[PDB]
Symmetry: D3
Subunit: 140 residues, 6 copies
């Protein structure tokens, strides 16, 4: 089931993300394997999406990460995430990892980062926080 | 009312936040002036808070912002924030601004940043996003 | 957007549904295009899925429909659906249509049934109920 | 308490159901004996109720069952049913039994079917699914 | 509909309430006539119900009112009551009226008090608060 | 943490309560130390606040207690209080104690009453109900 959800998230990212380089999506799943929340990476809702704003490095000032969006959407709609797992097509950065911990999510399921990534340092802080705070990491 | 909530938020930060430089709190409030969520800045729950982890600039890798915490708590407990206002003792950084927009919060109430702040560039992106996305900014 | 959700729903069905003839999925989506609930067709959770139980016509006694599942999951988790739209890879049968009406879903988005379908009579009652009760039907 | 809730449901059916032959109601009860959801059998809300549409067999194309309505109402309003019991004046048919299982309801409390019933075959499938999926049945 | 709910409430009180003098129940109902919460008058859950504790006037120190119970249950289970109506077999006392106003209930439906009632003074304050705060009172 | 929440509640009462003699506030806290609900004592929302209505003894006919307001607000907004603790600047009266028990709150954290209080008899009934119904009382 986890691998199928990962495949489902890869497709969601390809369908919806306007990021020209890296399309990211995340699914928050409860203990009955039901979907509690979904997000993809994009500029905030209604924010004009121009070519200049989607180029690197400018885009980092504007882009909302997929995992942050799944959690913000649950806050917006009042969907309780405590105790769920998060399945994400990309390992969460340090800022998303903070949100995952504080939102009560207990497990991150994803793929091992391409260690040519420019996010490797951010991911190192993610792993330090996850392991000490007791959030499991599972790689498919 | 907004001013009394800001004062309450200031006291919340002084009571709870362990940041040695800048203690921040935020309150999310609905149209009846009822409190829907509260947060303060701090390291993730259960992350050992050593002096080295709270020193600047290392603390930025670990500290969870007050507004991010209030939103993440609402996702954790399934408390709907759509349509609420957020009263914060510090203007939200660009990342918190993305969360505010995506969680359906309509209005930010805070103090005008001290123009000696090191966060002015981040706040500059916050206001560009708030203005295009139609989030009202109210200064006390 | 509706078309991308329909495509995502199609992939969800192909990944998860064990029906050997017709795999169906549905997405319930609010006015911000956020996903509130998801379902696919399958036997009840934990019911052993033997070849005999999945053969037609015996499977109709056991199979839970995708739209029924998405609504039942929302009841299970307390996720409010009032005012949402439902995007489904198959037009809802008359029983699913009753659930859609009673759960406050306002709009059905799907494909026009293949006029070789064995469900045309059931769909005929669905549309009579949708029209009198004011549920919009939108075909992709 | 269970028998009093059953009596309460019998009265609710008599008060509200327009079915000319069989009036049905159901109460979803949590582990503190609080009422989480209530339904009765009827045509969908706002659907014209004519004599022709309430006659047998035509009515089966239109009538929403009491247990299906209690669950659809919880989906509509975002009331969490997971782990509750359902007390119903009539044994749930196979379609309602699927919804009961998927909505997380753990126990069905009702009266033994009159085994002159035309629903006996549908009830046989209900019992097969309940017993294998671990939903208890209690007869008063 | 309001009259049928009042009748159902009367029966609920007769079935469940242990008050030897006056059995009271209340139903909180949304704009679709769905039941959001139900209560009846009784001592707190688990408080031993001796004859001395149910005798007047000692019972007033312990008895929980039906309308207070329906609201407290909604707080317990997180069921939103904002905008609902309350149908009660007895006019709410001044304390219940404060709860009704603060929980966002918009309308009280009940019977006109028997002018031999010992609660007329309390009801007098109830109506002054309902009128200034804009809660509609409807008598059956 | 409990003592800091008590200090936070004392300030909230001083900021917001218009009671000329005794300002009261209460915080409902979950097992992760997150704030679920907040209240202070005051006349009902929108009720004209005149000097005559805030004088003793007239005010008791109108004033909503802080703990009752925290619970009514949770009912209004659909915030689930079951299993939380309540931290209050004043010991709950017998009527608030009934609401605390019925709303699923499991622990009262407060300060020992000034035993020159005119509420001592009401508090005696509170303690009888709390101890028999299994709600803990903790004094700071
Ligand atoms: N189901 C959804 C819908 C939206 N979003 C997030 C992704 C972006 O951060 C933001 C906005 O998404 P879009 O840009 O796709 O949608 P807009 O509303 O901005 O419209 P448009 O596509 O015209 O830009 O919301 C999400 O995570 N999940
Ligand atoms: N009501 C609360 C409780 C917690 N938090 C946030 C602040 C921090 O980002 C994180 C953890 O807070 P603390 O460090 O104060 O609490 P811990 O659980 O880590 O315990 P300790 O005080 O021993 O560090 O949760 C919050 O915003 N609001
Ligand atoms: N995210 C989910 C998970 C489940 N279901 C529904 C589909 C079926 O009606 C039922 C059970 O699904 P599965 O058969 O896939 O899962 P089980 O729990 O039965 O396990 P298994 O795959 O071993 O049969 O729940 C759903 O609609 N959406
Ligand atoms: N508290 C309620 C209210 C309604 N329903 C269900 C029963 C029917 O399936 C549908 C419609 O009920 P009614 O026919 O009684 O109400 P309408 O809104 O259709 O009005 P009318 O009575 O004029 O037909 O809603 C329910 O289960 N519980
Ligand atoms: N569906 C319910 C269940 C309970 N209550 C309220 C009524 C009383 O104020 C309290 C306790 O009800 P009971 O006394 O009937 O139930 P107990 O749990 O105390 O058990 P017992 O019947 O053995 O006294 O809860 C309610 O309003 N609605
Ligand atoms: N965050 C809040 C807001 C309000 N209340 C309660 C306290 C009173 O019982 C009632 C009304 O509060 P106020 O009198 O402060 O507010 P009003 O809306 O009545 O306005 P005003 O201050 O002009 O009287 O609501 C509360 O407990 N918590
Ligand atoms: N935890 C993360 C990290 C990154 N991203 C998003 C931000 C960018 O849109 C993209 C990475 O862009 P790039 O590969 O160009 O750095 O992935 C995300 O959604 N979640
Ligand atoms: N929108 C923001 C921006 C910053 N902070 C927090 C992070 C740090 O803990 C502190 C600022 O630290 P300093 O003053 O050392 O930059 O405020 C916050 O909670 N919300
Ligand atoms: N509204 C509907 C109608 C049908 N189905 C499911 C039931 C079966 O699993 C499949 C159709 O099977 P067949 O094509 O063999 O009739 O679609 C569904 O999920 N929703
Ligand atoms: N599980 C079930 C089965 C049936 N019914 C309803 C449908 C009809 O309105 C009535 C039975 O009608 P009859 O006895 O004429 O078949 O009961 C129901 O609400 N729930
Ligand atoms: N608004 C009110 C007022 C009273 N009661 C209850 C309290 C007692 O149990 C009963 C009245 O008792 P008596 O008739 O002896 O005064 O009604 C109630 O539930 N709601
Ligand atoms: N459990 C209680 C008891 C009392 N109060 C409020 C009611 C009055 O506003 C004040 C006490 O007023 P006094 O001290 O004049 O009796 O405290 C409260 O909020 N909660
Ligand atoms: Mg966009
Ligand atoms: Mg800590
Ligand atoms: Mg299965
Ligand atoms: Mg009708
Ligand atoms: Mg009892
Ligand atoms: Mg006021
Ligand atoms: Zn990230
Ligand atoms: Zn920030
Ligand atoms: Zn169907
Ligand atoms: Zn049925
Ligand atoms: Zn009362
Ligand atoms: Zn009190």
């Amino acid at each position: 089931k986890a691998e199928k959800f990962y495949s489902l998230a890869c497709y969601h990212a390809q369908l919806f993300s306007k990021d020209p380089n890296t399309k990211v999506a995340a699914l928050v799943i409860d203990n009955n394997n039901n979907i509690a929340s979904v997000g993809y990476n994009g500029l905030p809702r209604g924010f004009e999406e121009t070519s200049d704003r989607w180029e690197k490095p400018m885009k980092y000032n504007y882009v909302v990460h997929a995992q942050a969006n799944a959690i913000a959407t649950a806050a917006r709609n009042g969907v309780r995430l405590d105790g769920c797992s998060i399945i994400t097509t990309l390992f969460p950065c340090k800022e998303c990892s903070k949100l995952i911990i504080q939102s009560g999510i207990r497990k991150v399921i994803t793929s091992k980062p391409c260690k040519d990534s420019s996010w490797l340092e951010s991911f190192s802080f993610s792993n330090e926080m996850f392991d000490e705070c007791g959030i499991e990491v599972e790689y498919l």
